[PDB]
Amino acid sequence: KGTRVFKKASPNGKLTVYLGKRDFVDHIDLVDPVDGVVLVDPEYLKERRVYVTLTVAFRYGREDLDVLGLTFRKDLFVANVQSFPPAPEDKKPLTRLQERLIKKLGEHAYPFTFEIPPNLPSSVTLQPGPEDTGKALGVDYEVKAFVAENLEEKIHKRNSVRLVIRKVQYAPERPGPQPTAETTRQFLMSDKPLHLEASLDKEIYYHGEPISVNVHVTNNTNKTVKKIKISVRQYADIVLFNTAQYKVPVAMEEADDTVAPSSTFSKVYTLTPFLANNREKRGLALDGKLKHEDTNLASSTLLREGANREILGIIVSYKVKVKLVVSRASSDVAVELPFTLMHPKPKEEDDDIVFEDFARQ
């Protein structure tokens, strides 16, 4: 049915890995499996073992993996699997993709499968402090196929193939509408408050999905609201290797909409957080490299009560701010409204097999 397979080969061209996808969705209860095949040249059946490794790491540094001073690494999950010879099989519930690719590719195709446990951090990367784009903090998911004899041998880079895959976070919606945030404020000389109320149409938004902010002002003061700023801010808390908090606006609408003294005002504003308009910003959490076009704003960190926060590396969350600019001569009244930002739902309601390079995007 038009099956695209992504593939990459070792530098020495003797090992090749096939995947059906780059992005593996996390569904809260399960992460859909990394189901792949490794083709091998029998030319190397002398060295005689083909291992595949999934590594999940928090790193500080470059994606070239140079360790050119001031580098950090901490593994968060590791899964090794001996793909040749076919070991005590565990479970090889060969996916239709796997059975297809094995029988098309031939005798020396051997499957590999990784089950990613839930509650791992999704792919995320962030450039800290000054803009030099030198080194980045992040979590990535590396798939590594190599021919060796054991898992202690130093492996020559000509024999390895490395693919950086993405774990992306989905969550479904089932609401009864989101609660309002609200603030009462008195303005010398008030004696009666300006009351600010705002709410959001959904708890859960997806990349590219517009956000609608319902804004309701009851001004029992003599002051005049002159301007209304509506904002989406990302919050990014580094919790491994170097504790730090960043906050970056990612959408903004100023309306010269006024609220008259002793009047009530109501209006729905609509706003979409877009990475394209933050391509320049640093301290901004993304789900992948700025280079690649499949990169978006980082998804929200799904936190379950009493979960180890530290090993998530980067806690990402999002808020809508509604700010009333009040003429004194100016003052600010505001609320902030939490929401969850998720990866959009994957559209999946002779031989159709077109190989594509995995290499980047």
Question: How is residue 346 annotated by DSSP?
Answer: P
Q: How far is CA 263 from the centre of its chain?
A: 43
Q: Are strands 211-219 and 181-185 parallel, antiparallel or unpaired?
A: unpaired
**Cα dihedral: 274, 277, 279, 281 (round 10):** -100
Amino acid identity, residue 146? F
Mention every residue, 6+ apart, whose C-beta is less than 8 A from residue 264.
216, 217, 218, 219
Check which CATH number belongs to the domain holding 254 and give it.
2.60.40.640
CA distances in angstroms from 147 to 89, 153, 164, listed in the order given: 19, 10, 19
Identify the domain containing residue 331 by its residue range: 181-342
Q: How many CB atoms lie within 10 A of CB 153?
A: 13
Q: DSSP E strands: which ranges in 34-71?
A: 34-40, 49-61
Contact residues for 28 (Cβ-Cβ < 8 A; gap 6+): 118, 170, 171, 302
Q: Enumerate residues 6+ apart whose C-beta is below 8 A from 160.
A: 10, 15, 144, 145, 146
SS3 266: strand
The residue type of 65 is L
Q: Tell me the H-state helices in 62-202.
A: 96-105
How many angstroms separate the CA atoms of 76 and 322, rounded? Answer: 38
Structure tokens that stand for 65 in this block = 């993996």
Distances, alpha carbon 122 to alpha carbons 148, 166, 179, in Å: 30, 7, 27
| Cβ-Cβ contacts under 8 Å for 21 (sequence gap 6 or more) | 6
Q: What is residue 201's DSSP assignment?
A: S
**Nearest alpha carbon to residue 167 among 21, 10, 336, 273:** 21
Annotated resolution, angstroms = 2.7
Say if residue 1 carries a ligand binding annotation: no
- Residue 226's H or E segment, with its range, is strand 225-238
Distance CA 93, CA 320 (A): 45
Neighbours of 211 (CB within 10 A): 21
Take residue 235 and report the two structure tokens written for it. 């919050």
Please report, in angstroms and rounded to a whole number, the separation of the first and last CA atoms in the chain: 23
d(CA 35, CA 18): 9
Instruction: Please compute Rg for the chain using Cα positions.
Output: 25
Breaks in the chain after residues, C-to-N cutoff 2.5 Å: 328, 349
At 98, phi and psi to the nearest 5? -70, -50
How many CB atoms neighbour CB 333 within 10 A? 21
Do residues 19 and 113 lie in contact, with contact meaning Cβ atoms separated by under 8 Å?
A: no
Q: Which residue has tokens 């009851």?
A: 218
Is 74 known as a binding-site position?
no
Is 135 annotated as contributing to ligand binding? no
Phi, psi of 99 (to 5 degrees): -60, -40
In this structure, what token pair is assigned to residue 347?
Answer: 């559209």
Elucidation technique: X-ray
Is 103 flagged in the annotation as binding? no
Q: How many residues does the chain have?
A: 361
Is the distance from CB of 192 to CB of 234 less than 8 angstroms?
A: no
Instruction: Take residue 49 and report the two structure tokens written for it.
Output: 């073992």
Q: How far is 30 from 160, CA to CA, in rounded Å?
A: 29
Q: Amino acid identity of 319?
A: K
Dig out the tokens for 209 from the structure.
């999905």
